Ligand SMILES: Nc1ncnc2c1ncn2[C@@H]1O[C@H](COP(=O)(O)OP(=O)(O)OP(=O)(O)O)[C@@H](O)[C@H]1O
Ligand SMILES: Nc1ncnc2c1ncn2[C@@H]1O[C@H](COP(=O)(O)OP(=O)(O)OP(=O)(O)O)[C@@H](O)[C@H]1O
Ligand SMILES: Nc1ncnc2c1ncn2[C@@H]1O[C@H](COP(=O)(O)OP(=O)(O)OP(=O)(O)O)[C@@H](O)[C@H]1O
Ligand SMILES: Nc1ncnc2c1ncn2[C@@H]1O[C@H](COP(=O)(O)OP(=O)(O)OP(=O)(O)O)[C@@H](O)[C@H]1O
Ligand SMILES: [Cl-]
């Protein structure tokens with residue numbers, strides 16, 4: 001039965017805190033499996049400044065860390081342990097979200113509109129791309 | 143408790159058929175009130191080139207009421223509305239006035255063209271102050 | 279050399295007045311050919327509720343030709359066109375068919391509402407294969 | 415007279431190479447001043463993984479470096495030296511582009527649609543935001 005994708009940006013509490021009741025409600029409808037995905041973004045510009053000569057941490061360690069934080073966030077959702085799965089990817093958030101939505105495949109993607117503290121843009125760049133490009137239903141949470 | 147706005151384009155059966163399961167589900171979560179709205183478009187271009195709106199509104203209301211019979215919803219929790227104007231304008235205005243907690247809309251009319259999101263879905267998902275479910 | 283497509287909404291004087299200086303400038307860079315297009319909208323909603331298009335097309339052509347007289351462009355480098363359909367559809371189709379090297383469009387009808395980019399400008403800037411100047 | 419903003423992402427040759435003839439042509443119309451801006455993007459997510467405990471280079475040095483590369487890119491435009499100015503900022507590219515467009519103020523912003531090598535998205539996140547949110551004309555170059 002139903003598969004729901006919940007992209008999580010571990011860098012912000014509220015983008016997560018907002019979706020909780022929606023993800024739970026959508027899941028309870030028919031005991032769906034809920035896949036949570038955090039994406040460690042690629043750094044093309046910093047790359048051009050010589051930062052990877054210059055050094056960022058190993059991607060293997062960055063993913064292990066991002067995964068541990070995602071795992072803590074997942075536990076904030078009241079969902080049975082067998083209906084949940086944690087994923088970490090590397091890339092543009094929108095690219096990897098859309099890739100996973102296709103690969104699973106997702107029947108619904110549940111995302112926040114944007115970061116709370118910034119009002120100006122009514123839709124964030126990832127939310128906007130995902131809404132437009134997903135092949136499945138997309139719930140934009142406000 | 144919750145209020146759900148369901149904009150319906152009475153001229154497209156598939157846009158309407160597509161959201162049925164989602165509306166029914168979303169309503170049942172907490173016995174929400176469901177408002178259906180259809181909007182008779184403004185024709186400003188035609189105005190530049192030179193029946194009664196009363197009558198068009200009654201026909202649209204009649205067709206929306208028949209469409210509502212395709213949804214399993216409690217009769218006492220449902221309301222139908224007809225408006226005149228740009229659809230996105232009147233959808234957004236009703237979302238603020240109700241106010242709506244969710245708007246449920248289909249993405250676009252699928253066809254042989256390259257678009258992925260319709261002009262009204264795009265404006266609604268962007269400008270609504272509440273959550274928006276874009277159905278595919 | 280270059281081909282410039284200039285979609286005109288004949289019903290809005292300001293959308294048209296706003297691009298005049300940009301079209302004139304863009305043309306003069308290299309003595310470009312300028313194609314003006316106005317699109318008579320499709321009314322599928324009205325079709326669901328139940329004069330001649332020949333006649334509407336001739337009136338629109340006539341109004342577009344009068345609008346073209348507000349531009350300083352060489353008469354031999356200008357062409358006017360009228361189409362029927364969704365404006366963005368027919369704009370994009372003509373941009374591919376000419377093909378256009380640039381499309382020059384105004385952003386939106388400014389008014390008391392929150393929108394910043396009109397439905398046709400948005401689709402054109404996104405889907406055109408060539409450069410697009412969005413005029414403010 | 416006229417002021418043109420040309421946002422440049424120093425991390426890609428073609429996003430730059432494409433705009434050249436357009437920027438020159440727009441400038442020659444009436445001897446406009448051309449402001450070039452590169453934005454060093456803020457790294458909220460990497461921040462949450464402890465990378466700034468963990469270390470990226472000093473922002474002062476990152477800006478000096480980004481500026482030196484921008485300066486080389488600017489010289490690829492056939493423009494008089496007194497009608498050109500280089501800027502570096504820190505933040506979201508779209509935020510800082512829009513800020514500068516307002517502050518100058520810009521009469522036109524000239525931007526590429528997206529990165530060449532990625533076809534999927536017809537408009538990049540920064541291009542899309544700038545087109546929508548700029549108060550002035552925006553030329554999207556393809
Ligand atoms: N790195 C990420 N990994 C997983 N999901 C993400 C990531 N970034 C964003 N998202 C998803 O997209 C939602 C909306 O965030 P988005 O990035 O589009 O807004 P924003 O941060 O305000 O925009 P911008 O990133 O353009 O500043 C998030 O709530 C989350 O669901
Ligand atoms: N006239 C209308 N009245 C009420 N709601 C509408 C109307 N038109 C569209 N909608 C709502 O918006 C949805 C998406 O339709 P939209 O018009 O955005 O797609 P489209 O017709 O493919 O795009 P466009 O009208 O740009 O060509 C519909 O499922 C419906 O929920
Ligand atoms: N009927 C049309 N024919 C030809 N070009 C048009 C037509 N309508 C709009 N355009 C082109 O698109 C531009 C922007 O108009 P647009 O319709 O996108 O704004 P809007 O009317 O504010 O939005 P909407 O029609 O969504 O409410 C116009 O300046 C014109 O270049
Ligand atoms: N860091 C930057 N500083 C200055 N301008 C930028 C920056 N990033 C993008 N731009 C401007 O925006 C244009 C289009 O790039 P955009 O980032 O929107 O496309 P993309 O890289 O394909 O998208 P994404 O960044 O969403 O992957 C660039 O050509 C450039 O003019
Ligand atoms: Cl926005």
Ligand SMILES: [Cl-]
Nearest residue numbers: 256257258259
């Ligand atoms: Cl699209």
Ligand SMILES: [Cl-]
Nearest residue numbers: 392393394395
């Ligand atoms: Cl907008």
Ligand SMILES: [Cl-]
Nearest residue numbers: 534535536537
């Ligand atoms: Cl796109």
Ligand SMILES: [Mg+2]
Nearest residue numbers: 009124125126
């Ligand atoms: Mg973000």
Ligand SMILES: [Mg+2]
Nearest residue numbers: 151260261262
């Ligand atoms: Mg429609």
Ligand SMILES: [Mg+2]
Nearest residue numbers: 287396397398
């Ligand atoms: Mg219009």
Ligand SMILES: [Mg+2]
Nearest residue numbers: 423538539540
């Ligand atoms: Mg980019």
